[PDB]
Enzyme design. Sequence first.
Site, PDB file in Angstrom:
ATOM      1  N   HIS A   1       1.507   3.936   1.588  1.00 51.29           N
ATOM      2  CA  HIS A   1       2.308   4.219   3.049  1.00 51.29           C
ATOM      3  C   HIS A   1       3.494   4.936   3.087  1.00 51.29           C
ATOM      4  CE1 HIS A   1      -1.314   3.347   5.936  1.00 51.29           C
ATOM      5  NE2 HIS A   1      -1.587   4.835   5.658  1.00 51.29           N
TER       6      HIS A   1
ATOM      7  N   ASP B   1       6.194   4.561   4.995  1.00 48.45           N
ATOM      8  CA  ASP B   1       7.234   3.638   5.725  1.00 48.45           C
ATOM      9  C   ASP B   1       7.236   2.205   4.793  1.00 48.45           C
ATOM     10  OD1 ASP B   1       3.920   3.340   6.530  1.00 48.45           O
ATOM     11  OD2 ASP B   1       4.850   1.807   7.317  1.00 48.45           O
ATOM     12  N   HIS B   2       6.396   2.279   3.276  1.00 46.95           N
ATOM     13  CA  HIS B   2       6.490   1.290   2.715  1.00 46.95           C
ATOM     14  C   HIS B   2       6.990   1.546   1.301  1.00 46.95           C
ATOM     15  CE1 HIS B   2       3.924  -1.444   5.246  1.00 46.95           C
ATOM     16  NE2 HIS B   2       2.981  -0.048   5.426  1.00 46.95           N
TER      17      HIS B   2
ATOM     18  N   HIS C   1      -6.737  -1.550   6.083  1.00 48.51           N
ATOM     19  CA  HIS C   1      -6.585   0.038   5.958  1.00 48.51           C
ATOM     20  C   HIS C   1      -6.001   0.949   5.428  1.00 48.51           C
ATOM     21  CE1 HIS C   1      -2.472   0.362   8.286  1.00 48.51           C
ATOM     22  NE2 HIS C   1      -1.685   1.087   7.231  1.00 48.51           N
TER      23      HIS C   1
ATOM     24  N   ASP D   1       0.310  -4.423   5.542  1.00 51.64           N
ATOM     25  CA  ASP D   1       0.049  -3.781   7.395  1.00 51.64           C
ATOM     26  C   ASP D   1      -2.137  -4.202   6.897  1.00 51.64           C
ATOM     27  OD1 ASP D   1       1.596  -2.416   7.376  1.00 51.64           O
ATOM     28  OD2 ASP D   1       0.648  -0.459   7.784  1.00 51.64           O
TER      29      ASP D   1
ATOM     30  N   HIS E   1       0.580  -1.137  -0.111  1.00 48.88           N
ATOM     31  CA  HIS E   1      -0.101  -0.314  -0.196  1.00 48.88           C
ATOM     32  C   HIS E   1       1.065   1.495   0.120  1.00 48.88           C
ATOM     33  CE1 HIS E   1       1.020  -1.004   4.210  1.00 48.88           C
ATOM     34  NE2 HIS E   1       0.797   0.166   4.513  1.00 48.88           N
TER      35      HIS E   1
ATOM     36  N   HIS F   1       5.471  -5.041  10.324  1.00 46.97           N
ATOM     37  CA  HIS F   1       5.835  -4.675  11.502  1.00 46.97           C
ATOM     38  C   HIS F   1       5.945  -5.308  12.667  1.00 46.97           C
ATOM     39  CE1 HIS F   1       5.437  -0.381  10.504  1.00 46.97           C
ATOM     40  NE2 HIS F   1       3.821  -0.714   9.471  1.00 46.97           N
TER      41      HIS F   1
END
Length: 259
Positions: A59, A61-62, A113, A133, A57, A171
Site C-alpha cells: 500500500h 502509505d508503506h 488486508h 495493517d 504490504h 496506524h
Amino acid sequence: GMIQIDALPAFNDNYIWLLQDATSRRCAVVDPGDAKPVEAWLAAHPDWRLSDILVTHHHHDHVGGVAALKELTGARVLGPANEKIPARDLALEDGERVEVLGLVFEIFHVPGHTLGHIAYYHPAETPLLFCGDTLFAAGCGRLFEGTPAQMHHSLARLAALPANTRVYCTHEYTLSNLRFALAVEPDNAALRERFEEATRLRERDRITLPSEISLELSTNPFLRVSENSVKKKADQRSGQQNRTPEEVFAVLRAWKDQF
Ligand SMILES: [Cl-]
Ligand SMILES: [Zn+2]
Ligand SMILES: [Zn+2]
C-alpha cells in the site's frame, strides 16, 4: 546488541518504526511511506547507516518512500513476495527467516488486508511483531483484497504468539478501534479500562503502541470471535446465526466498516 525502537510520525496516523543499533550505529525502518522523516533522522545522525528497509504490504502509505531511500542509502529492501514492492531486493515467503540488525525475524504470510501481506516476528524473551495493517491495537485492517476467512486465520496465527509479544502495527487507530470494541462488549471490564487509558494518552498526544498480545486477546473484538458475548452480539447485529468463528468475524468486520 541493544535495539531501540522508535516511531517516526508520518501522514495523518502512520508510524514509520525505526529500529536502532546505537552501538554499531546502524538503523532499519519498517514501511517508510514517507521518505522525508527518515531522511531528516539520517541527516541528524550523519555517522549512522540505514541498512535495511522492511515492507509489510504494497500500500502507498508503506512504500511511498522506499525507492528514494534505497537510492539515498543503498539499504536492502525486504518485501513480501507476490506483490509489487518498489526496489525490492528480497522477496519473502511464509516460513522464511531474515537477519536484520542481528535479530532473526520469522516471516508470516498473513492474507486478509492484502493478498500478499506479511509480518515480521522476532523470537526472544520479549518477542517483537511487525504486522503492518493486519493486526491493529484493539482492531484489524479492512479487507481490501482478502476474505474474512483469510483474515481470521491470519489473526489466529498472531494470537497464538507469546502473550508478551510486542505488537508494532502501523496506524494510530487505537482510540477509534476501542470505540467500536465498546459497541461489541460494553461490559468488558478490561476493555473499558483500556479505553480510558488510551483516551489519556491521545489527549497528551502520546503513542498507543506497541501493544501486547495478551491485552489484545482480552480486549480486541476480532480476536474474541469465539467468546459467548461477542458471538451473541454478532447474531444481534446481523439477525442471523453465525455458526463458525469465521462468520462471527465476517459480521464484525463488516460492522466496523460502517461504524
Ligand atoms: Cl478499520
Ligand atoms: Zn494498508
Ligand atoms: Zn496502511
